[PDB]
Amino acid sequence: PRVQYRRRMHYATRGNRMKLVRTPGNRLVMQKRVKRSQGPHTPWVLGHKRLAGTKALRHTEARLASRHEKSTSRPYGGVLSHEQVRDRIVRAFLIEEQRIVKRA
Amino acid sequence: KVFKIDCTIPNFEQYFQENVKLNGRKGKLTEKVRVGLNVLTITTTMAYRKKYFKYLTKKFLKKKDLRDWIRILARGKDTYQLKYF
Amino acid sequence: PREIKNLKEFLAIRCVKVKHNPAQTKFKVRCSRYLYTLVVADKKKADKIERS
Amino acid sequence: KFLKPGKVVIVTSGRYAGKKAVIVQNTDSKSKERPYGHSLIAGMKKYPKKRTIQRRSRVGVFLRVVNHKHFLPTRYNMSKQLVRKLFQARYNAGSNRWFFQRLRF
Amino acid sequence: TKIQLVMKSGKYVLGTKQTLKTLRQGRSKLVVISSNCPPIRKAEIEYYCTLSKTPMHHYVLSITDV
Amino acid sequence: KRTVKMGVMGRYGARYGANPRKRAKKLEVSQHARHFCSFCGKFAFRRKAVGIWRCDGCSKTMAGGAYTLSTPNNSTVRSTVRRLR
RNA sequence: GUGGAAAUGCGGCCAGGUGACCAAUCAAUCCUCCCACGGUGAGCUUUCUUUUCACCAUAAUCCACUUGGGCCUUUCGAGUUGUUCGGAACGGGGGCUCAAGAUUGAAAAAUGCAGUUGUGAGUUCUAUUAAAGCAAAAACCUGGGG
RNA sequence: AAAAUAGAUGCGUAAGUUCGCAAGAAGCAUUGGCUCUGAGGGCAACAACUCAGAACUGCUUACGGCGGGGAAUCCAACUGUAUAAU
Ligand SMILES: [Mg+2]
Ligand SMILES: [Mg+2]
Ligand SMILES: [Mg+2]
Ligand SMILES: [Mg+2]
Ligand SMILES: [Mg+2]
Ligand SMILES: [Zn+2]
């Protein structure tokens, strides 16, 4: 069993990964291995971490995914880690409370 | 498990029991591997591979020079009728 | 190839391919999109819908 | 010593983070089923935004148990339908203007 | 300082992940805060520390009992 | 394992000359040393490109010197700003 | 819109993310290979040979649902082959969630083949030098706000 | 030019030196076959295959592949580049 490419492209680049596959017909057949992307992340300046409620959908299928598959139902849900939201909810509240005090 | 060989379509009685081996030793058939008949049924408590009997047959037919006359097949999960061409 | 499991749905649902198996009897309902199948173990109810 | 009832908390987790909330009941003792102090918490599930404008003034409300660590106690102080009016009307008076002003994260 | 004798004299919680919780309960009898604390973290204990009417000493450590 | 003398420089073998290694060795180690973080109070800084020091603890990035988190020149400017305060 | 104490589950503009970027290694599957077993076919057969060889296949798509990581919660050790880590939360109990994966099944035995699983190995894919720091963008996504 | 060295293991390894090296320095040594032994793990209440040792026995020293070494002087520090076709 030696295999050859089936899609018109023939280079071992990262976007052209292939999977060897024994078939029902007992052929051994290369198949395109999907170009998996890492999923949604909290922003790079906030340490760039993978989000919890969100799937690493390729945008090729992200359009067809349910909205909540790419988010949590929290404010900034598809954008920020829960701690990052809570950092703000505190920082919004506490900073305004000092400003409200600087009028006195 | 009783293995069998349906010769009915077309010695061989004898050749087997001399030439079968319950362990390393040949031709020393313990009561646990009885044999006989137009079918050489081989009763056994022992764990023989089935194709071993397809084998002793061919090793038998090559002696009588029949193997280009007749051909073994598994006509059942536990049988070998001897056919032809 | 999604598989409808309960009968109530399947009786609701073009040409259908019955397939007897040993220890089975599938009912492969073809449709515009999916080939729905309904597995049916014991035969007493297999022709119970086959004769439908 | 200040998770007293009527105290307003800003929720810091769940769907309702950033939402204001008065504590209703408060049970600081750990429960056999809630190993955490857990205030009841009516909140703004919708801050307010003739009858052209009336929909806009509708306030949402949520009643919830909440671990003390999942809301933020404030300087401020103050049955889902029943809770809704007592700070619906509380709103119409404007007794707590800030409470019905949502946080801007 | 004198807070060291506090370590043997009585109880002390340590770290914001629970020094804050001694402060809700008001079990806290004092709250030290190292300078190293980031301002929004430190402000947060600084804010509970006001609601609990707890003593506050910029220097996280909380002394529940002593 | 340990070299008698040249440590990180041991990788260079018998080349580039002794002094230049001696002088590369100081910068080479402070460069890969973990430098103290005033933010965390933690040894934690590690360089990630010349003049860039990521903090392993709290995500953060001081600017800093090339082979060292702080230049001696910088020691002056920071207090000198402190005194102007 | 909505459940959940929580991690989170289900149902114009603005900012962020995916795109998106590393040798190796480790691990899982993949694959190939080997072995053991069992079948089936073939071959050797002067002698010997429970034997030698071959084959024993499982596509995308979908549906129900172990390893690595993140996190929630609750009440000096932890850790790797390895240069770590911990009150800025370690470990333990329960939970969440991602990424692979397993198995259940639909496909799908009406196919393949010809007259079976499992087990081992390899392959596969998913730090260092650095005065070197290792593309962009559409598309798309999610949000904040309306 | 040819020959020569040669793999692995265990020993042993000089000057000089920028202390990294030089170094595979150099230099001896043992090595097959066979029948055994020992060691090295997993999961519960079977899996490797390396190392080690031992007798017995064999040599015609009997594939392929695989450094020759040393002492000095000149030059260039080093890796590199470079007159494709002297
Ligand atoms: Mg498939
Ligand atoms: Mg020559
Ligand atoms: Mg010497
Ligand atoms: Mg030169
Ligand atoms: Mg030339
Ligand atoms: Zn730091």
DSSP A34-101: P-PPP--B--GGGT--B-SSB----HHHHTTS-GGGB--SSTTTTTS-HHHHHHHHHHHHHHHHHHHH
Residues of F at the E interface, defined by Cβ within 8 angstroms: 38-41, 58
The two three-digit tokens of residue A23, written as one number: 């078939």
Contacts of B2 (CB under 8 A, 6+ apart): B41, B42, B43, B44, B78
Residue D47 and residue D70: Cα distance in Å, rounded? 20
E/A Cβ contact: 3+ pairs below 8 Å: yes
**Which tokens hold the place of D26?**
């408060």
Amino acid sitting at position E19: T
Task: Give chain F's count of helices (H) and strands (E).
Answer: 2, 4
C-alpha span between B54 and B48 (Å, rounded): 12
Token pair, residue C11, equals: 């009786």
User: Which neighbouring-strand residues pair with B3?
Assistant: B42
Cα gap A42→F33, rounded to integer Å: 29
- For chain B, the first-to-last Cα distance in angstroms comes to 30
Cβ(B84)–Cβ(B72) below 8 Å:
no
Q: List, in sequence order, the alpha helices (H) in chain D.
A: 51-54, 80-86, 89-93
The distance of A85 to chain D (nearest Cα, Å) reads: 8
Distance from CA of D50 to the nearest CA of A (A): 32
Cβ neighbors of B54 (< 8 A, separation 6 or more) are: B72, B74, B80
| CA distance linking residue B7 with residue B59, whole number of Å | 15
- Give the integer Cα–Cα distance in Å for C36 and F9: 70
Amino acid at D40: L
User: What residues of D are in contact with residue A73 (Cβ under 8 Å)?
Assistant: 15
User: What is the CA(B51)–ligand 5 centre distance, in A?
Assistant: 72
Question: How is residue B79 annotated by DSSP?
Answer: B
Amino acid at E31: V
- The dihedrals phi and psi of E4, each to the nearest 5 degrees, come to -70, -40
Q: Which nucleotides of H are covered by protein (CB under 7 A)?
A: 17-21, 77-78
Of F26, F15, F22, F16, nearest to F66 by C-alpha is F26
Report chain G positions within 7 A of protein CB atoms: 1-11, 15-21, 30-33, 37-47, 49-52, 55-63, 69-75, 84-89, 96-100, 105-113, 115, 125-126, 128-134, 139-146
Strand G within 7 A of C26 CB: yes
Dig out the tokens for B48 from the structure: 């023989």
Q: Do F39 and E34 touch (CB under 8 A)?
A: no
Calpha distance F68→B83 (Å, rounded)? 90
Closest nt to residue F4, judged CA to C1': H19
In the sheet with E31-33, reading across from the earlier edge strand, the strands are: E13-14, E61-62, E31-33, E56-58
Does at least one atom of strand H sit less than 7 Å from the CB of F18?
yes
CB C46 within 8 Å of CB C37 = no
D17/A93 CB distance under 8 A: no
Please give the Cα distance from F64 to F74 (Å, whole number): 9
Distance (Å) of CA A23 to CA A6, A19, A20:
14, 12, 10
d(CA D1, CA D5): 11
SS3 content of chain D, % helix, strand, coil (to 5): 20, 25, 60
Provide the shortest C-alpha distance from residue A53 to chain E (in Å). 24
Contact F40, E38 (CB under 8 A): no
Contact flag E36-F58 (C-beta cutoff 8 Å): no
Whether E47 and A91 lie within 8 Å, measured CB to CB: no
Task: Return the amino acid letter for A84.
Answer: Q
- Tally the C-alpha atoms within 13 A of residue B62's C-alpha that lie toward its C-beta: 6
Which residues have a Cβ under 8 Å from the Cβ of D20 and sit 6 or more positions away? D8, D9, D10, D11, D43, D44, D99, D100, D102, D103
